[PDB]
């Protein structure tokens, strides 16, 4: 195969010792991507040829969850094809890999000195620390950011990978990877993202994709849409409803402490539980989960049975960690392997549904509050 | 100096070709022993006159590791004294060396044909192969033994000796030594030794000592206690707690792939973490590491910082390779330079702590399981 790297991949030269740190980063990245391929292709449930993914937590006509075998989607097929080419010619793909030590586009972080201490690679990369970031921010956002990042190892180690992975892909099994990838406080600066705790208590990182460590633009003339990484959301937080053009996959790693520790919702934009109105090149979708109506839209997540979910384009989705033992546990949360399949086409912006009532209660947004989602059409 | 060999050292005539093969073995043995001497005597840490050794991974009064400058121990001073005499008059000491080609006391092995082929000496010695030994045994012990011995060179080559050794003592630098010494599956036939994978996945060999290639009984009327060799323990294994009369020294060669790949515990018999009751001519020591209490007793091992440990008489110890990247790595383990200092006095038996109850299973013992150690007094 012929790899064309992204345009911000630059020639690099390392000392003998530095190259060992980069090679360990690369090797664990390759394990992550081989396990990712196996997670897609290994059959589960009643699917004969690939993994059974939840595509709607609540189908309006059936009143139950809806699944699909994940390799039925052409975009997922292409992700698998590109991972296979990467893994078959790793020396070629590695031309497109760098540790993002001097990445200028935007800041990338490491949670804490403790996390940094997990690997010589992470100490050498020397990203700014999120403990420093949230000390400067202060307030309730800073308190949530400190709770997550000062306890990041413990939160992210509460995982069970034994059923759907043949190698531990968590921070315990791949500590150089998790300690060295660029972590991003994606909601800390966004007032529309809801509560102070959710904004300070959310992080994600990208191993592979247009902004990750492995940045391949094309393989054999095909645009690489794969964007793979991880996410971490502190316990006792709720987020507003989300939607976006790119299709998205989540594999839950967290071993819950109670059955309803981690709940999630995904429903297609044209689901009859919502009200739709055509708009200039899009849809206005009204969501009304008031008076307990929201509860049936949310399903419990775990790393064995309800572990895999696939979001079609503009599907409405949310992650909810307020119920049950979230009111008593400590240093806990929701931790996933995350991906998007079409990162190089359409609009990648993560959109948030807004209060039907207005910016005023934007901070107290939960799944029971009536919301409005302004969807845009995508290009075929 | 005057050397008196052990009683099973016999005179043997060699052809010119055989003597050459014996000589190469002896020459690498002398390098191994000279490096051993330097590892004891070269100051490290805050020790001014000799190497800083860990003697307790967890002191109960301080809650921290405890160290000692290793030449403060009179038995270590005597190993150093006797190594110096060997190195000063190697022709005299060579009278007590033989390749154990026809050693009668018990079987000695070579891991595999591949390892055997690493040196003309080992091909000539023609030990029985552990690949053959474990094919016959079969089952889960045999599967572990084959995994270790089919991949012996890869496992034992994952070493970094640059910091504390001036010549590489690993298989990569002394291939005749490592391929020719007699390897022993010390736990393969011991039903008390714990899991089937630990039992098949353990090996040690003895260069110098009462059962080694160099078998000196006395130097200048002093009994030589020195017993020096190497150990290999396959990854993803744990062993029961150990104890024994002879003092013991471990120098870690494996370069870990995660900071917690290779963990060890050593705590003196009278450590207040345990409960002691005076028994007949000994001490009953009860150990309770349940509910995570064991974790603080175990320290990470590497060849640079926590590379040297010294076990006082009857000190409880264990080596634990279940954590972290042991759930992700392959063809890996823990490899050490091993020694005992008083191999000619008291009871040399390696003792194992047992499960607290009759219902408790040996095949599952891990550091977290309550255990009972029946210690015997030594002769002062
Ligand atoms: C925070 S991420 C990794 O951009 C994905 C968030 C989402 O849209 O679900
Ligand atoms: C003689 S052995 C097989 O090294 C005993 C192992 C130990 O007690 O550390
Ligand atoms: Zn999303
Ligand atoms: Zn021992």
Author numbering:
A (entry chain A), B (entry chain B): 22 to 401
Please share text taken word for word from the publication where this structure appeared.
Dimethylsulfoxonium propionate (DMSOP) is a recently identified and abundant marine organosulfur compound with roles in oxidative stress protection, global carbon and sulfur cycling and, as shown here, potentially in osmotolerance. Microbial DMSOP cleavage yields dimethyl sulfoxide, a ubiquitous marine metabolite, and acrylate, but the enzymes responsible, and their environmental importance, were unknown. These diverse organisms, including Roseobacter, SAR11 bacteria and Emiliania huxleyi, utilized their dimethylsulfoniopropionate lyase ‘Ddd’ or ‘Alma’ enzymes to cleave DMSOP via similar catalytic mechanisms to those for dimethylsulfoniopropionate. Like dddY, cloned dddL, dddQ, dddW, dddK and dddU conferred DMSOP lyase activity even with equimolar DMSP present, which was not surprising considering the similar structures of DMSP and DMSOP, and that these DMSP lyases have cupin domains and similar catalytic mechanisms.
Cloned dddY from A. faecalis and Acinetobacter bereziniae conferred DMSOP lyase activity to E. coli (424.2 ± 20.6 and 359.4 ± 18.0 pmol DMSO per mg protein per minute, respectively) and purified DddY proteins yielded DMSO and acrylate from DMSOP. In contrast, DddY, DddX, DddP, DddL and Alma were more efficient (3–13.3-fold) using DMSP than DMSOP, whereas DddK, DddQ and DddU were more efficient (2–83.4-fold) with DMSOP. Note, DddP, DddX, DddY and Alma proteins generated 1.4–5-fold more DMS than DMSO when incubated with equimolar DMSP and DMSOP levels, consistent with them having significant DMSOP lyase activity but preferring DMSP as a substrate.
